[PDB]
From Swiss-Prot, chain A:
<comment type="function">
    <text>DNA-dependent RNA polymerase catalyzes the transcription of DNA into RNA using the four ribonucleoside triphosphates as substrates.</text>
</comment>
<comment type="similarity">
    <text>Belongs to the RNA polymerase beta chain family.</text>
</comment>
<comment type="subunit">
    <text>The RNAP catalytic core consists of 2 alpha, 1 beta, 1 beta' and 1 omega subunit. When a sigma factor is associated with the core the holoenzyme is formed, which can initiate transcription.</text>
</comment>
<protein>
    <recommendedName>
        <fullName>DNA-directed RNA polymerase subunit beta</fullName>
    </recommendedName>
</protein>
UniProtKB/Swiss-Prot annotation, chain B:
<comment type="subunit">
    <text>Interacts transiently with the RNA polymerase catalytic core formed by RpoA, RpoB, RpoC and RpoZ (2 alpha, 1 beta, 1 beta' and 1 omega subunit) to form the RNA polymerase holoenzyme that can initiate transcription. Identified in a complex containing RpoD, the RNA polymerase subunits RpoA, RpoB and RpoZ, CRP and DNA. Interacts with Rsd; this prevents interaction with the RNA polymerase catalytic core and with promoter DNA, and as a consequence, promotes transcription from promoters that require alternative sigma factors.</text>
</comment>
<comment type="subunit">
    <text>(Microbial infection) Interacts with Escherichia phage lambda antitermination protein Q.</text>
</comment>
<protein>
    <recommendedName>
        <fullName>RNA polymerase sigma factor RpoD</fullName>
    </recommendedName>
</protein>
<comment type="similarity">
    <text>Belongs to the sigma-70 factor family. RpoD/SigA subfamily.</text>
</comment>
<comment type="function">
    <text>Sigma factors are initiation factors that promote the attachment of RNA polymerase to specific initiation sites and are then released. This sigma factor is the primary sigma factor during exponential growth. Preferentially transcribes genes associated with fast growth, such as ribosomal operons, other protein-synthesis related genes, rRNA- and tRNA-encoding genes and prfB.</text>
</comment>
Length: 50, 64
């Protein structure tokens, strides 16, 4: 049901909308999108379970 | 086109308020242009004041 609500198709515009939400008012830029995502959840720099 | 994208973004600024975004997302529009931008803009400026100083001469009223 949720998929049926999902308007999105690709990795790219998905990441655009993520980028957008966490950086409102900002235009779509690929590199910054994947950079942001990779910082948030798989980068050892800025995320730790301990 | 950045004004093409500023169109949509400004259409849906998520009630953002920071002029940091405004100025930076404006000045990001126009990119770098140098190394002949520098010299052709220079030649244009100096040609401007050249045609000025050309204009200056042959003075009937500006007697001093």
């Amino acid at each position: 049901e949720t998929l049926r609500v999902d308007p999105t198709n690709d990795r790219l515009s998905a990441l655009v909308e993520i980028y957008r939400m966490m950086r409102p008012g900002e235009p779509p830029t690929r590199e910054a999108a994947e950079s942001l995502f990779e910082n948030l959840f798989f980068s050892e720099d800025r995320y730790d379970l301990s | 086109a950045a004004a093409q994208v500023l169109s949509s973004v400004e259409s849906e600024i998520g009630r953002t308020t920071d002029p940091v975004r405004m100025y930076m997302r404006e000045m990001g529009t126009v990119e770098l242009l140098t190394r002949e931008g520098e010299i052709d803009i220079a030649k244009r400026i100096e040609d401007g004041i050249n045609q000025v100083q050309c204009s200056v001469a042959e003075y009937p009223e500006a007697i001093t």
